[PDB]
Amino acid sequence: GEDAFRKLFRFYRQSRPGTADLEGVIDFSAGAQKVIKSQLNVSSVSEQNAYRAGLQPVSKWQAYGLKGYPGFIFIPNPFLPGYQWHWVKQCLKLYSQKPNVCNLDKHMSKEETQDLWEQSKEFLRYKERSLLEKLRWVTVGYHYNWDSKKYSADHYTPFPSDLGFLSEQVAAACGFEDFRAEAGILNYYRLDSTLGIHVDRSELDHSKPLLSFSFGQSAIFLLGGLQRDEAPTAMFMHSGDIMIMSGFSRLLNHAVPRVLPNPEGEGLPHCLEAPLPAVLPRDSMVEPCSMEDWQVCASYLKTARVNMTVRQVLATDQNFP
């Protein structure tokens, strides 16, 4: 298409890394015109409960916004060293299992899909195709119907309570105290994958914010207007980065035109080199990651991005209509 968004989506899909092509992409980790401050409520989440999600204390968090996009909040990586591996491990291993609908279910059964993890262990032994490599989305909580474009009181699997915990802290720190993680879409990217221009319009309550977690390889994110004519702003999303779309930003058109290969070759971003600590807190929502688990996760994220996206579908007591 020739309308501003599709033009730019096209440009960044076909962008060449390590050239002048990415000059206009904002990097929140490292421009100065558009990027602005954003206060987080620091006393909201305790130093102990941030510890339980694998997060730094909220006091340590950098948090930015954008000129022209009120309500858009961008953390950088808050996560403690190593703790990104638990969340990446859940998204591949636990969350994709059934119950809890993945994209492989349209043309396979519970027979074929049930040993996605064990198969990908077997790909470790075969040094020098797979189910994990075909996985593109998983839903949790209220399952989004891609065809109907609706949620339903019928189609739901209890939200993962550890992910619901991480969600609540991130929500509260951004000034969203009574946030209920009711619905989850997870997205899995190869280096050639893209997510098309869309608006996350089919939750019923548009007060409540949209949480967008990111892990592994970097991606470009286009955030645009209320209609697709308007040209978007490009920004990088790095491993561990978090994105709230709240207020005016909630119902904005956005996309991911590109996932990017590591600049220094193949291999992981530097932040993911640190492993999970052996000593984990007594009361934690994070669970020890085995040696084999880390190895599958590690080899996958060398050429993949995983995104988690946590939403509230119904107002605090808007029983399903």
Ligand X SMILES: O=C(O)CCC(=O)C(=O)O
Q: Output the smallest distance, CB 174 to Mn ion, in A.
A: 17
Q: Output the smallest distance, CB 198 to Mn ion, in A.
A: 6
Residue nearest to ligand X (CB): 307
Q: Is 308 annotated as a binding residue?
A: yes
* Residue 221, beta-bridge partner list: 235
Q: Is 306 annotated as a binding residue?
A: yes
What is the residue whose two structure tokens read 């309550």? Answer: 205
Q: Output the smallest distance, CB 42 to Mn ion, in A.
A: 28
Q: Which does 286 bind (CB under 5 to 8 A by kind): ligand X, Mn ion, none?
A: none
Residue 309 near ligand X by CB under 6 A: yes
Residue 307 near ligand X by CB under 6 A: yes
Q: Output the smallest distance, CB 200 to Mn ion, in A.
A: 4
Q: Output the smallest distance, CB 167 to ligand X, in A.
A: 15
Q: Which two tokens stand for residue 43?
A: 């006393």
For the window 170-209, what string marks contact with ligand X as x by the rule CB under 6 A?
---------------x-x-------x----x---------
Q: Are strands 210-216 and 304-311 parallel, antiparallel or unpaired?
A: antiparallel
CA 139/CA 127 separation, integer angstroms:
32
Per the CB < 8 A criterion, the answer to whether 230 and 7 are in contact is no
Q: Is 3 annotated as a binding residue?
A: no
Q: What order do you get walking across the sheet with 195-198 strand by strand?
A: 195-198, 254-259, 219-223, 233-237
For the window 182-201, what string marks contact with Mn ion as x by the rule CB under 5 A?
------------------x-
Q: Which residues contact 47 (CB under 8 A, 6 or more apart)?
A: 57, 59
Per the CB < 8 A criterion, the answer to whether 251 and 44 are in contact is no
Minimum CB distance to Mn ion smaller for 211 or for 271: 211
Tell me the site size for ligand X, rule CB under 6 A.
Answer: 10
CA 121/CA 163 separation, integer angstroms:
25
Q: Which does 185 bind (CB under 5 to 8 A by kind): Mn ion, ligand X, none?
A: ligand X
Between the alpha carbon of residue 166 and those of residues 134, 173, 306, the distances in Å are 27, 11, 16
Residue 212 near ligand X by CB under 6 A: yes
User: How many CB atoms neighbour CB 270 within 10 A?
Assistant: 10
Minimum CB distance to ligand X smaller for 44 or for 193: 193
Of 131, 85, 135, 95, nearest to 295 (Cα)?
Answer: 85
Q: Is 143 annotated as a binding residue?
A: yes
Annotated binding site for 2-oxoglutarate: 187-189, 305-311
Annotated binding site for Fe cation: 198, 200, 254
